[PDB]
Ligand binder design. Sequence first.
Ligand SMILES: OC[C@H]1O[C@@H](O[C@H]2[C@H](O)[C@@H](O)[C@H](O[C@H]3[C@H](O)[C@@H](O)[C@H](O)O[C@@H]3CO)O[C@@H]2CO)[C@H](O)[C@@H](O)[C@@H]1O
Ligand SMILES: [Ca+2]
Length: 769
Amino acid sequence: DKISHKIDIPDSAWTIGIGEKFKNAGHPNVKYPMIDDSYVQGAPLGGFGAGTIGRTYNGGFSRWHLEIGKNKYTTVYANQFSVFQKVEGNKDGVAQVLYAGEPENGYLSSWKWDYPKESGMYYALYPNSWYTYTNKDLPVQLAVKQFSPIIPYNYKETSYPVAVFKWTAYNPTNKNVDVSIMFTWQNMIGFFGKQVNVNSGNFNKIIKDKSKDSEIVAAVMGNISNDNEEWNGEYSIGVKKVPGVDISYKAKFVTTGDGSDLWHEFSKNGILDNKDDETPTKQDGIGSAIAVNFKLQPGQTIEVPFALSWDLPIMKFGGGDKWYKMYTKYFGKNGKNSFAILKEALNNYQKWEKMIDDWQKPILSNKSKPDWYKTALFNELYYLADGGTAWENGKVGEKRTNNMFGLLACFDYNYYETLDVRFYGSFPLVMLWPDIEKQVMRQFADTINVQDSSEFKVGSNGAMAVKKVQGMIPHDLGSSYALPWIKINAYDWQNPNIWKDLNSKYVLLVYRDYVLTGKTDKEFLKYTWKSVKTALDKLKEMDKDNDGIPDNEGIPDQTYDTWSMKGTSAYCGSLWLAALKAAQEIGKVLKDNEAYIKYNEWYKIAQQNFEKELWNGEYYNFDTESDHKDSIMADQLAGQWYADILRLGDILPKDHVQKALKKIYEFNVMKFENGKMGAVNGMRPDGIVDESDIQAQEVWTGVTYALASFMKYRGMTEEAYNTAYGVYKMTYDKSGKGYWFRTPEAWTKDGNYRASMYMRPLSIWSMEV
Ligand SMILES: OC[C@H]1O[C@@H](O[C@H]2[C@H](O)[C@@H](O)[C@H](O[C@H]3[C@H](O)[C@@H](O)[C@H](O)O[C@@H]3CO)O[C@@H]2CO)[C@H](O)[C@@H](O)[C@@H]1O
Ligand SMILES: [Ca+2]
């Protein structure tokens, strides 16, 4: 490997061999069907709300999130980079697709597949990833840096449906070598959203944009239809000329054929026919190819940028609503703008790289933090783009000031902005994209007094319940299968209108968003204040026995939605205390004296009773009325965790908090698989895992990262990082279970998982407050 010195890959990048087999991979641990796309994954390309494309460590474009809210894992074999090299003096050169695999059928059989093992590495530090190619049959060593412009405090480039592939080529040998790099792409219009005639009318055109000191050559892969539908738009690939490279292209090759129409050209001398051909296809799949060819002398390096864009302006959800995607603000809505997007990227990618470096540098340059922590901190952010992210710029047909936003809990449980989850998972948004965060919270504020008296069957028990109760915060803002933002509470496993955590978490999120954006946004507090008061007042009515605390009802009535709580729980009780303290402080800021007094009075009574009921001398009991009331819960002091972040002080005595956290580390971490797998949710005081429910026997990745943050704030530095380390290890390490770029909600002691591609572990960003 002589190419690594010519590029700049951070030491904290996650690494794997191209073509590496992983032996230890985990699988779902539930009895119902659940997504398992394998460990062949990579960092995604694409902006927020753009639809994303997962290119894996083997080189394939395989995890398709272009249909917003859906996860489709299938390798589109035509989509590749390929290389040709010929040493000056030799009769023939060699050509190789840069993909460690081959197609399942006979399409593209002429291409040279099966990029060999031990011949290159993949690296990722989101939003960047890299591949190096160090192959004994390729005298010139190559590397590519690929990324999308995901940039904190930037809501423009961050939305773009574009990727840059910045290639570096170096000749360490003593002979001249002719080199070509070719990008191939299938015209994917009709890949989704088209019920019949899936390729019909697809056509490819070539754009040559020549001005002084800029030449771009691009293929635009579209359809003859000017219809404005979810399926229609354009893909583009292209390259920018640099000194010493020539560009060649082929507008149309057949993807549903042997591929020799293209490959016979490329494999000969690395130069394509430059054949334009706009003839639309009927049944056959078609694609385009863009190549560069150059000669490298001994010791010479060259850099050349390619790009990919996709202009698919309309997202459709299963309930029938069609919305424009956010990026259409910047490029238009007609779906004929892929070239404009591509050109912006090719002309500005160097600036974007520097903007990315500028945001990563403060963390990367901090030599007190271990590399593994940096690996996790950056790579967990993949989910902000990959989580079915929806970001609208108008309903099709029907303008507003604001752009509604939603991130899925996950794909298996297809619910937008699940509030009990975002309490953990929304830290990157408040810290890095706060205008999105505040918009999402205003979305929740607007739902508080919505009433929907229609009934649904509760999954856990079969009982009928009212969809949405006035004054109760919704579980979620809908499903991609139905009507995001319009029909809330798509979740039906339990009835969220009787949950004891949603209303408190809502208030805590509101105050969090004020505190972590500088305690200056009084208008945000004003917008949400009525809903905050309503939320707390409604939750107070669920206090059955006048101890000042809402009563859990002996069913799962909170985020641990198969784990029953009864009476006063440490979890919901602490959240309630913290929410009351936050509302007191908002009351002070907004000069609402009567609210301050009321919530101060409720807080004092509740605090006193919480302590009496639950403090056992070593930790806080799980609850007051369950069979396993004395279980040690990892998340027992969640309210105090948020209180630390919100600077609300001691809701519980410092001594007791420290004892409880030490107990959790000693038991839930260190007595669970030697502390190498995170914090198990429930442990009995005899040191055996609580078996009352499956969720007690799970480590929740987001709960564990949040607990690490809590320990860190409380000065338990070793415990904090050791606790978080087990989550990193299981996700990323060779000794783990292969969950990179699909971090699950949970795993059991065997390492097998529940709900890959999950929002909650974005809580690792709470470790940076
Ligand atoms: O909907 C999201 C929630 O799902 C919970 O899992 C439940 C599944 O949604 C549900 O389909 C499954 O159904 C069981 C059924 O209860 C049982 O009687 C039958 O024999 O088998 C079905 C599965 O084939 O139940 C599970 C719970 O066990 C998650 O647990 C929850 O966290 C999530 O939010
Ligand atoms: Ca009570």
